[PDB]
Amino acid sequence: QCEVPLVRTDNPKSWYEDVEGCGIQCQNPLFTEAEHQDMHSYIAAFGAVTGLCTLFTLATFVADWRNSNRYPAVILFYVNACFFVGSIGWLAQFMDGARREIVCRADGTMRLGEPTSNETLSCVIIFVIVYYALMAGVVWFVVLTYAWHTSFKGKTSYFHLLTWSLPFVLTVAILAVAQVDGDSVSGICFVGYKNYRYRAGFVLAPIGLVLIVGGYFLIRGVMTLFSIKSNHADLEDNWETLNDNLKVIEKADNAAQVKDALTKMRAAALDAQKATPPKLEDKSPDSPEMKDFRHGFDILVGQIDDALKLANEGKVKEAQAAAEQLKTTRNAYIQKYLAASKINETMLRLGIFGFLAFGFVLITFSCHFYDFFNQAEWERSFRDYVLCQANVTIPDCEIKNRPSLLVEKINLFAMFGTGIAMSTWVWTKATLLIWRRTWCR
Numbered sequence: 001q002c003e004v005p006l007v008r009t010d011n012p013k014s015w016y017e018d019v020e021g022c023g024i025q026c027q028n029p030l031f032t033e034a035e036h037q038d039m040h041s042y043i044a045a046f047g048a049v050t051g052l053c054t055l056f057t058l059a060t061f062v063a064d065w066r067n068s069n070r071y072p073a074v075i076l077f078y079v080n081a082c083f084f085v086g087s088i089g090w091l092a093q094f095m096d097g098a099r100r101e102i103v104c105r106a107d108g109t110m111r112l113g114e115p116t117s118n119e120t121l122s123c124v125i126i127f128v129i130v131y132y133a134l135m136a137g138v139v140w141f142v143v144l145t146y147a148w149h150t151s152f153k154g155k156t157s158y159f160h161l162l163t164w165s166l167p168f169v170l171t172v173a174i175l176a177v178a179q180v181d182g183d184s185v186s187g188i189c190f191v192g193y194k195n196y197r198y199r200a201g202f203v204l205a206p207i208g209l210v211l212i213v214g215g216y217f218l219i220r221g222v223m224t225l226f227s228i229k230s231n232h233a234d235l236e237d238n239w240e241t242l243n244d245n246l247k248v249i250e251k252a253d254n255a256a257q258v259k260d261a262l263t264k265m266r267a268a269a270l271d272a273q274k275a276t277p278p279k280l281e282d283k284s285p286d287s288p289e290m291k292d293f294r295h296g297f298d299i300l301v302g303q304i305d306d307a308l309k310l311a312n313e314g315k316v317k318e319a320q321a322a323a324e325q326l327k328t329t330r331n332a333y334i335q336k337y338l339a340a341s342k343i344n345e346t347m348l349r350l351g352i353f354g355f356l357a358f359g360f361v362l363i364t365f366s367c368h369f370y371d372f373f374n375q376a377e378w379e380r381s382f383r384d385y386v387l388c389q390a391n392v393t394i395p396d397c398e399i400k401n402r403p404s405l406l407v408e409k410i411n412l413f414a415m416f417g418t419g420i421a422m423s424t425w426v427w428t429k430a431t432l433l434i435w436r437r438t439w440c441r
């Protein structure tokens with residue numbers, strides 16, 4: 001009765017749409033066996049590489065767990081933790097005969113509407129292991145960005161309830177609606193393949209959520225470093241040009257250079273006043289300390305304007321004399337706030353890893369968008385192809401459009417590429433000693 005891609009099944013539960021005794025075949029009808037075994041080889045690579053890289057970092061973080069549980073470094077361990085769990089699920093398919101066990105029902109049809117009766121949970125198990133790891137990962141990614149964010153403006157750890165609960169609820173949720181569909185080319189079960197509304201609601205949207213949140217802490221994070229960094233530079237720049245012109249006023253032999261220098265000094269004196277020093281980054285624009293800063297220049301420029309009041313009249317012997325008195329004013333209201341700023345490489349690399357993680361997560365969001373965007377067509381060209389290839393009666397039947405294997409190879413590059421990058425948090429020149437030190441056993 002049946003005909004490719006429809007396969008014979010006595011099971012009423014597996015019948016396709018309203019066709020008698022015909023369910024949809026397990027192996028994805030939208031891809032050739034060549035595309036399967038190529039895509040499997042892909043995952044086998046990145047799946048295995050990341051799985052090892054992460055476990056190396058897990059195994060290292062526990063080799064100094066005493067001095068590797070303190071924030072913010074402990075985050076990268078839980079970020080790595082989730083990744084190692086995720087890698088497991090993907091690598092599960094390559095076990096001989098598992099890829100068919102995860103995706104196919106009893107009657108040789110691709111798993112759908114899982115969890116279902118009389119069908120082993122080997123599908124929903126894989127879906128849980130992955131979906132939980134994925135979500136627990138990005139939630140811990142928010143923790144990572146938030147920790148880096150506030151390090152300038154902390155032992156408190158009430159994230160655990162949040163990082164472990166939110167993925168759990170989301171997991172139980174998809175199970176409740178029973179929308180764990182299966183796929184052969186990837187070798188994993190996941191939410192809403194047949195019904196992609198669940199995929200958008202449970203994957204695209206939560207990832208889109210952590211993106212805008214995780215970003216805000218990275219955006220408002222670098223702006224805190226951009227402020228501190230640029231402000232010291234702005235103060236340093238002026239202080240130096242100020243001390244140059246100071247050296248020009250003395251060496252000068254006319255009232256023209258002294259006036260010009262005094263103006264170059266005043267032009268820098270003011271531009272330096274319009275900046276929050278790195279020592280007062282945490283204070284308010286209307287705070288007391290910030291007040292003494294800006295007021296310190298109101299006196300300074302006053303001293304300059306006094307000198308200018310002598311340079312213009314032509315009192316060079318007396319204008320240069322005021323420039324000497326500017327040394328003490330300088331040392332008072334400038335040398336104090338100037339300089340003094342250290343960030344530590346601990347936060348530098350967290351910024352690197354904070355941003356590097358953000359990027360590859362944004363890619364994952366992009367993939368699951370397109371996959372969600374064009375699927376409505378992949379349904380049309382399928383339902384038509386089913387009715388076509390069944391109409392064979394005795395080239396014409398050919399699938400119009402399908403999921404781009406490129407988009408997946410891109411996703412699985414970034415999805416794993418993150419875990420590979422997150423694993424290099426412990427690739428510093430200080431970690432080898434940790435392993436040599438514990439090596440004594």
Ligand SMILES: CC1=C2C[C@H]3[C@@H](CC=C4C[C@@H](O)CC[C@@]43C)[C@@H]2CC[C@]12O[C@@H]1C[C@H](C)CN[C@H]1[C@H]2C
Pocket residue numbers: 024028029030112182183184185186193194371375378379382403408
């Ligand atoms: C087969 C199939 C699909 C294979 C597609 C999936 C969207 C995303 C990916 C990810 C990508 O890496 C590989 C390909 C994969 C798994 C798509 C969902 C719709 C459909 O499932 C329906 C079941 C239903 C019974 C009938 N109609 C069926 C088909 C329209």
